[PDB]
């Protein structure tokens, strides 16, 4: 036929891509960072515990001031917390209790959330009525909302389980751009520090790098066996880490277009729910289904610490923009601030 | 007592928020949450017709001092294992199966009949790790159409291992036993089975009778016995 000739053309292009990226692999990152002196044992102790949620916390997002954080749980509430004093600043009752994601705007005026109702609702925090209001609701996905991330007060990238990411204009309510190309449910999303790129990992063991202005897929990253649940950019904007269900974190470089490091252990057999980097990018913190978090030395692939405070699965984590603390939320209804 | 005036008023605001959160969690804790599963054309829609009269569809009904919330998740065409843990801790799972889909082959592909598809879905959610202890109310729907269709098209179309009568009650009891035989661990969870048509008006009484046992078990867990 002709479509089989086109798929032989696609297989020729795929092994050309693989040979051109194995031509770049001259030395691994474990050879470059061999004589780098190790991190040592990272002993982070839990400093606060945020106790107001009554169900499983599915997401959390730090504000840009590194003090306020929002957390969404499936009792239909999202609480904004003051992490310094453990105070509750607001508690927003959600219209659908089945939240999977929550986002904080970098201005601090908006929070977004969404989930199994396929809508990223957007909540105005800075109202002169004194109560939080639903400013906009963004329908247009045909699968569940799995990640929302703000760029401005007027733009938000939402990833979803209809194999599609989308860029939204908030004040009109319409999708500006649709990002298609994944063949499984897009589970995670991480914007670049310049917010001109974002990576999105899906359930087809793939991570794709998207240009927000052009609307296209620039690079596609493989290496995982199972569904990528977590994705997080490096602070340089030149690499990212993906966590997946095959009990493995992997670091992928953008300008090299392949995988640099893999963070595995033979005791680790459960999937990875959340990843984030520290402020330097030296530590890769990863949350697990074995109820604890592991601190990975991201340059040497050595386990540098265990954050072992939770009684159920760590579903969400975030490092502050200060670099000062890690928040880890979990299915046991608690947020813990670690330092 | 080393707080400011505004820090003390923020602590008072956070305690009022905690009071409203505690009261809303108490109001949500006395509500019966029901997953509604089943394949297509299995009579889920006539059951949502029977109880009260994009995304997840929520249905509320109150029946004899008990507020129910029924979640239909048939709309989301996604990989189910990425969100099925959201309904961990649901009170029961209502599973609708059309009895008349024993001979009806699936329109997705004609190698799979619809009763084997629903048996695969029941084996998937029955032996889930999130529903190890969750009671399952299995509704076997459209028994009048099954009564008309078992007269001439036998159950050897669907179950070729079956040897029995070509009447309603022997074939229906075989289908119910074939569904109830699908739990790998038959000790932790309870499966309830009820035959349904469009004319029945006691299926909500069957559902209330089945969730009274889950309420008794959770009351014993609240009172420290487990």
């Amino acid at each position, epitope marked *: 036929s002709e479509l089989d000739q086109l798929r032989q053309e696609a297989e020729q292009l795929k092994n050309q891509i693989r040979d051109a990226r194995k031509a770049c692999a001259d030395a691994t990152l474990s050879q470059i960072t061999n004589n780098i002196d190790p991190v040592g044992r990272i002993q982070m102790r839990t400093r606060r515990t945020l106790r107001g949620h009554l169900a499983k916390i599915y997401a959390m997002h730090w504000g840009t001031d590194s003090r306020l954080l929002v957390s969404a749980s499936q009792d239909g509430k999202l609480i904004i917390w003051d992490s310094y004093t453990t105070n509750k600043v607001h508690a927003i009752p959600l219209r659908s209790s089945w939240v999977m994601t929550c986002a904080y705007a970098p201005s601090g005026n908006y929070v977004a959330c969404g989930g199994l109702d396929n809508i990223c609702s957007i909540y105005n925090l800075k109202t002169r009525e004194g109560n939080v209001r639903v400013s906009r609701e963004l329908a247009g996905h045909t699968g569940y909302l799995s990640c929302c991330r703000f760029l401005d007060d007027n733009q938000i990238v939402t990833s979803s389980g209809d194999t599609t990411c989308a860029l939204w204009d908030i004040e009109t309510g319409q999708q500006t751009t649709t990002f298609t190309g994944h063949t499984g449910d897009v589970m995670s999303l991480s914007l670049a520090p310049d917010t001109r790129l974002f990576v999105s990992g899906a359930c087809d063991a793939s991570a794709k790098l998207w240009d927000v202005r052009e609307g296209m897929c620039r690079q596609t990253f493989t290496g995982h066996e199972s569904d990528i649940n977590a994705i997080c950019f490096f602070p340089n904007g030149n690499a990212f880490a993906t966590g997946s269900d095959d009990a493995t974190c992997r670091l992928f470089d953008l300008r090299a277009d392949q995988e640099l490091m893999t963070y595995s252990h033979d005791n680790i057999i459960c999937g990875i729910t959340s990843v984030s980097f520290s402020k330097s990018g030296r530590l890769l913190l990863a949350g697990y289904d074995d109820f604890n978090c592991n601190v990975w030395d991201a340059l040497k692939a050595d386990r540098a610490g265990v954050l072992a405070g939770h009684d159920n699965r760590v579903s969400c984590l975030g490092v502050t923009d200060d670099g000062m603390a890690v928040a880890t939320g979990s299915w046991d209804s608690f947020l813990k601030i670690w330092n | 007592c080393t707080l*400011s005036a505004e820090d003390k008023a923020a602590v008072e*605001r956070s305690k009022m928020i905690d009071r409203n959160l505690r009261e809303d969690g108490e109001k949500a804790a006395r509500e019966v949450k029901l997953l509604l599963l089943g394949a297509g054309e299995s009579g889920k829609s006539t059951i949502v017709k029977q109880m009260k009269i994009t995304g997840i569809v929520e249905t509320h009904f109150t029946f004899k001092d008990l507020h129910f919330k029924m979640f239909d998740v048939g709309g989301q065409r996604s990989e189910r294992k990425k969100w099925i843990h959201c309904f961990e801790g649901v009170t029961a799972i209502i599973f609708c199966v059309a009895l008349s889909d024993y001979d009806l082959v699936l329109a997705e592909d004609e190698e799979m009949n619809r009763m084997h598809e629903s048996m695969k879905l029941f084996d998937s959610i029955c032996n889930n790790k999130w529903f190890t202890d969750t009671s399952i109310i299995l509704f076997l729907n459209k028994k009048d159409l099954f009564e008309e269709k078992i007269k001439k098209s036998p159950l050897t179309i669907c179950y070729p291992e079956y040897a029995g009568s070509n009447t309603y009650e022997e074939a229906a009891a075989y289908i119910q036993c074939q569904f109830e035989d699908l739990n790998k661990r038959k000790d932790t969870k309870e499966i309830y089975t009820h035959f349904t048509c469009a004319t029945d008006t006691k299926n909500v009484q069957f559902v209330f009778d089945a969730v009274t046992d889950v309420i008794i078990k959770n009351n014993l867990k609240d009172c420290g016995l487990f």
Partner: single-chain antibody
Amino acid sequence: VQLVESGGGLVQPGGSRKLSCSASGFAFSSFGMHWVRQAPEKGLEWVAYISSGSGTIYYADTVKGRFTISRDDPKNTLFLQMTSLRSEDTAMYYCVRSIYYYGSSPFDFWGQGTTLTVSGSADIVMTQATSSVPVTPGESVSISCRSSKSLLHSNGNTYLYWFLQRPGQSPQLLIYRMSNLASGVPDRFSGSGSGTAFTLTISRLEAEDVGVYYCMQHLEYPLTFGAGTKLEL
């Protein structure tokens, strides 16, 4: 957002009056409420406070025992039951809404005020040393306030609030917590200071900035204002 104070008028001395302020257009139950009076050409004087949820009530010691502040949260109405009314209680009484969380704007909306005409060394003294600055438009004007105590707290906030009362109007908040600009306020206004010495810089003054300017501390109850600094064209 609107607050209409009602009551007041000719009250015999020793008598009684209930002031009432109906609130419309905002989530009234989450705001703490204040009464702030103003003697017929004196400065602002804080009277009472009720919390959100009514769980914390303060009074000035000038009115303690004689005044009772109470809110009715379904009817959206704040009351000040005033007994034993003296000739010093002749004032114009403002309702002020004030919400308190991390990063909130207290004292941000003031009511129009009703006129009642009846016919404390531990308090932080806010001293506005200048009382009148005559100024032509276009100029950059600084207004200085001085505090008896260091308004800087150990959490890092210095609780100093700036208000402007235009002629024939309610005071409106210009600056909260010594530097943060209020909503609906131009960036002409700026605030600075260490503990005990504070500045309000009106850069490039327009004709709408004419009025009396008040500092206020919110570090400790009772809340105390400055005497006020008049600006004239």
